[PDB]
Amino acid sequence: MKIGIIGAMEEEVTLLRDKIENRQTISLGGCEIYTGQLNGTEVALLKSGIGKVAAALGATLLLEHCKPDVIINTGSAGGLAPTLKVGDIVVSDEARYHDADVTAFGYEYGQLPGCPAGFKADDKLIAAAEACIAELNLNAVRGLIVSGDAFINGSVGLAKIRHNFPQAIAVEMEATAIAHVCHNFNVPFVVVRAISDVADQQSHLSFDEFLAVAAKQSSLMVESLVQKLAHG
Amino acid sequence: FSMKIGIIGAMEEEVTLLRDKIENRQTISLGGCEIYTGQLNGTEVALLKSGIGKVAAALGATLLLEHCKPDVIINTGSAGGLAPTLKVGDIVVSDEARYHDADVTAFGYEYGQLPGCPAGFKADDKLIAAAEACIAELNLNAVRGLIVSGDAFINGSVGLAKIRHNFPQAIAVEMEATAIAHVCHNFNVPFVVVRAISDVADQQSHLSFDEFLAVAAKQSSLMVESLVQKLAHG
Numbered sequence A: 001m002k003i004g005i006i007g008a009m010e011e012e013v014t015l016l017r018d019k020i021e022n023r024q025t026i027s028l029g030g031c032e033i034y035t036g037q038l039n040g041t042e043v044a045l046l047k048s049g050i051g052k053v054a055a056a057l058g059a060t061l062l063l064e065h066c067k068p069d070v071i072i073n074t075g076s077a078g079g080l081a082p083t084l085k086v087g088d089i090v091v092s093d094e095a096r097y098h099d100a101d102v103t104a105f106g107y108e109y110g111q112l113p114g115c116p117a118g119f120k121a122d123d124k125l126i127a128a129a130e131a132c133i134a135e136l137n138l139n140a141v142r143g144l145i146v147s148g149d150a151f152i153n154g155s156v157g158l159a160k161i162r163h164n165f166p167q168a169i170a171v172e173m174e175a176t177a178i179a180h181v182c183h184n185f186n187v188p189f190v191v192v193r194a195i196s197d198v199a200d201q202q203s204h205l206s207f208d209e210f211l212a213v214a215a216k217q218s219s220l221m222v223e224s225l226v227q228k229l230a231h232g
Numbered sequence B: 001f002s003m004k005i006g007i008i009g010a011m012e013e014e015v016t017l018l019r020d021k022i023e024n025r026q027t028i029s030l031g032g033c034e035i036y037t038g039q040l041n042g043t044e045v046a047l048l049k050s051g052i053g054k055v056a057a058a059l060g061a062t063l064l065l066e067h068c069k070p071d072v073i074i075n076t077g078s079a080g081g082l083a084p085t086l087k088v089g090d091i092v093v094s095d096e097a098r099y100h101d102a103d104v105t106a107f108g109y110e111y112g113q114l115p116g117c118p119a120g121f122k123a124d125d126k127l128i129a130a131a132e133a134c135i136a137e138l139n140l141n142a143v144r145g146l147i148v149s150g151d152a153f154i155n156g157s158v159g160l161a162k163i164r165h166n167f168p169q170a171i172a173v174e175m176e177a178t179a180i181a182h183v184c185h186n187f188n189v190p191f192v193v194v195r196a197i198s199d200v201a202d203q204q205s206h207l208s209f210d211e212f213l214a215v216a217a218k219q220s221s222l223m224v225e226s227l228v229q230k231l232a233h234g
């Protein structure tokens, strides 16, 4: 059982990278992949870079080059659900592009031709993630996570996302790309991110101040999820 | 005689003419993409049908580079013309590609730029020069310049206006180019976009696209055919 883990920023993968034993590093297509075991479990950790294309490139290499069984996307996110606070966890049951638009031809907003309107996360990955959340007494929300190539900082950007996806519990920039690639390779995935800001007018400041806290919380959650998938 | 030219088209209509001309053709179905290998007028090529959008294009370009390792990449297909002297059917050649929908300005990056990437991705000077040479020999009307990509089909209104304001110099807009340039950049692979105009991204761009997708395909395909030959034998 090999578990793939994808993080966008170094800060989001560094703590996990530090724990990987029998660690080997591969530099490819401008990305870095770290293989080895995390607390006894075989993993493949990828630092992709920010945005949809970087994450897609990275996920593609990870899949074709290491062949993981499942993909877990870790990292930070802007919280949209009213119950969310910095440090809290968001688990995807689904991912959709909030910035894709081909409605001129009758596709659903957010949907790209040749893809389903939304990519569903894997049920077992979701259940495991949630049992970890319960065992660690974490505050979390499960639901629609939307991705785009823009940092949401209130104003018009936030308004468009609320209009098109009022039920989105969070927004970020790599999730759906990873889901899309996993979809094309028939690989199950799940997003498990921690909130660094609430995508409003002060989100840049909040991101500066809470990225580290978000990276650590999601990172700990990924660690527990790996262990739970590996030994029930 | 030992060069392998990678060619990427998003839709089936856009790759079908080139595909039919491939000698000793074979097909590879992988990651939801299709790759056709063989030769084009004797030159070894690898033609990928990527699907629409930045992620589809990135996934395909990554598979193409990693799997077939072509020496250069040519992105063919249709596009919305933005430069004034462009008419449906005319050719657009990129000298650069930028995302018109990437925005991390809140952190000081340039509009269109993603962290870790240059603000724009430069196309290859030789591929560009060869393309202009083909344009001259075929006596076609064409424009060289910045091409911008996003995950939205530009249909006039604010979508179009924001693009003209943020990129006054952009000559065309489509949905895969920059994603392909981005992937080629990370692998350090020369690329060039050579597309043909199917609409002018205004209120009627969907209707125009319906009616002229075919001609855009024909014209970009003819150019691709001529460029492959040119790159192989001058």
Ligand SMILES: CSC[C@H]1N[C@@H](c2c[nH]c3c2N=CNC3N)[C@H](O)[C@@H]1O
Pocket (backbone or CB within 6 Å): A008, A009, A050, A051, A076, A077, A078, A150, A151, A152, A153, A171, A172, A173, A174, A175, A196, A197, A198, A199, A200, A203, A207, B104, B107, B115
């Ligand atoms: C430095 S760009 C923000 C990064 N962190 C995630 C993120 C956190 N908070 C937000 C993100 N992305 C967009 N809008 C937000 N409010 C995204 O996926 C990028 O990798």
Ligand SMILES: CSC[C@H]1N[C@@H](c2c[nH]c3c2N=CNC3N)[C@H](O)[C@@H]1O
Pocket (backbone or CB within 6 Å): A102, A105, B010, B011, B051, B052, B053, B078, B079, B080, B152, B153, B154, B155, B173, B174, B175, B176, B198, B199, B200, B201, B202, B205, B209
């Ligand atoms: C069916 S979406 C349009 C496709 N054709 C290209 C295109 C032509 N004209 C336009 C395109 N894309 C966006 N806006 C336009 N006005 C894009 O790269 C997609 O692959």
